[PDB]
């Protein structure tokens, strides 16, 4: 309904496939024309989820790693907006899995935060660094744990993400799971080795941050993991 100042981008977002192919086949430069957001038809097509348009662009050979003015590459956009097919297509074409935007996030931060399970797996199979830290020193796991994304927490641990990385507030993902009462998340993290002993910057451990009972449960489970092994 008009999201850009450049027509080809509005076409890209609105899914006008035939018009887009038609104009671009006449003027190939339109495929890489930038708008007021340093976006091209690719960024917009990824955002709206128009797989066909994206495929056309990629077969045409357009660059796949150009970031928009907020630092978002097409893979950040597709991953975040949950576009599986497009994400796959982008990876075959060489999209950078560990590219960062203006806030230090990789596409994996978004996939994890927004429950994009299948996408997270593709990114991780694609070489994604599970411990990438954003500008506040937060990882994909901090986002998943904080929000209560259980299965995503499984996936990250299963691809060996570290559980004891501290963000600028000194919080690990367990601290976050605890503070937001994400029970199953917290339990899984402790059963998976997360430390119940790390003090954050307010000098509070995950236990002190949790509900009284939750603290006692995690306490027991941590000592259970200690005892055996």
């Amino acid at each position: 309904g008009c999201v850009s100042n450049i027509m080809i981008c509005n076409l890209a977002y609105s899914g006008k496939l035939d018009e887009l192919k038609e104009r671009i086949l006449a003027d190939k430069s339109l495929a890489t024309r930038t708008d007021q957001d340093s976006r091209t038809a690719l960024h917009w097509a990824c955002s709206a989820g128009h797989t066909e348009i994206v495929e056309f662009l990629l077969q045409l050979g357009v660059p796949v790693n150009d970031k928009d003015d907020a630092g978002w590459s097409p893979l950040h956009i597709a991953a975040s907006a949950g576009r599986d097919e497009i994400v796959k297509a982008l990876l075959v074409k060489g999209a950078h899995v560990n590219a960062v935007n203006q806030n230090g996030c990789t596409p994996l931060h978004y996939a994890a935060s927004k429950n994009r399970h299948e996408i997270a797996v593709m990114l991780l199979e694609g070489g994604a660094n599970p411990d990438a830290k954003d500008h506040y020193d937060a990882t994909a796991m901090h986002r998943a744990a904080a929000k209560g994304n259980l299965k995503m927490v499984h996936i990250l641990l299963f691809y060996k993400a570290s559980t004891n990385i501290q963000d600028t507030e000194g919080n690990t993902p367990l601290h976050l799971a605890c503070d937001e009462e994400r029970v199953e998340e917290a339990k899984f993290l402790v059963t998976q080795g997360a430390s119940i002993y790390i003090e954050n910057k307010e000098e509070k451990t995950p236990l002190q941050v949790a509900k009284g009972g939750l603290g006692l449960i995690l306490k027991r489970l941590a000592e259970g993991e200690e005892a055996s092994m």
Partner: protein
């Protein structure tokens, strides 16, 4: 305020807004700055305004980054 509450207010205020699919409010919810329920409301309003300045009816990540920086000090 509660990080959980902070998320609730952000999703509540932006629930009537037209955000692009790639926007992830957790980028803001997760920040360390202590902010009020009023700041979140202003951040959200300022984001819509910044979108309008670009004759854009969809709100983008950049609008939020911008608005966050404006409101929070």
């Amino acid at each position: 305020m509660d990080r959980r509450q902070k998320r609730l207010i952000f999703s509540t205020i932006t629930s009537k807004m037209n955000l692009s699919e790639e926007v992830d409010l957790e980028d803001y919810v997760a920040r360390p700055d202590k902010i009020s329920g009023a700041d979140i409301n202003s951040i959200c309003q300022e984001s819509g305004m910044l979108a309008v300045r670009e004759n854009r009816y969809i709100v983008l990540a950049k609008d939020f980054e911008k608005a966050y920086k404006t409101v929070i000090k």
